[PDB]
Amino acid sequence: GSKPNYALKFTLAGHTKAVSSVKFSPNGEWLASSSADKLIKIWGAYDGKFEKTISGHKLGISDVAWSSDSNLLVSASDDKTLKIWDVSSGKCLKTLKGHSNYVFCCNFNPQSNLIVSGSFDESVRIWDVKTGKCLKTLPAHSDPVSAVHFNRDGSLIVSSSYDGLCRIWDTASGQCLKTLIDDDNPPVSFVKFSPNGKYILAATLDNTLKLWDYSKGKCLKTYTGHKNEKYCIFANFSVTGGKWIVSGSEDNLVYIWNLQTKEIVQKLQGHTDVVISTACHPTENIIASAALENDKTIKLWKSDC
């Protein structure tokens, strides 16, 4: 149909502090959750079935991300490290050391030979997955780095910061290609490339999501009606059915907009705290949502459209 009809299917309990992020495995099999409780949990994507806990970080985790082949995870922790995990064995393969403050955000490149990280230390780091060596340190920002993401061919990195900037980096050289957002304020709390790599979705802490044309460097769409003044809340392109934008919200709801029209097409109610993270299943019309410490649950929602 023209609108989605996401309905609650499962509630996933077990984290003992705020959930920080949820991500679907590229192969659709799994949901991974990270939490302030220092743990990663793996869940069945379709039935919410608890699979395993992955442990090792000495402090809370802000983010977790999947390799392209669904075999590895990378986590970003307040212990100033990232850890690369074998999902099958649950073992830590590498500890990525070099950040001087909390590591907030992380992603594999499509090749999954590199990891990008952003930290409270105001740097972006590019790591070799095989060796766990830091290849490049980018002096990217003048305040904590809120998000990092590679584009579809891995040639570009997009970063965002509380400094109010969105910057695009050449992966090979680490050199800045452009400053896409150049305001003193507000803080840019989230950024990611569109599936096709032509657009950047950016959240600012003035209750606003914006879709930017990367090449032209101008704003194509604005999404409002949600609450976002404090937290680095993820946002998604939903592509399996209708073409939506999905975001959590500080009013404890998930918001879904029509990408083209910018109209809100659904609000998902159930969480009892800030929805910090949403993920869209790679093949099925399924949303995962995760909430802060008054809730500490993950919800799986499914839609016919």
Ligand SMILES: CCOC(=O)CCc1nc(CO)c[nH]1
């Ligand atoms: C327990 C509190 O979790 C958080 O506030 C972390 C949320 C978070 N947002 C991004 C966006 O790149 C990474 N991590």
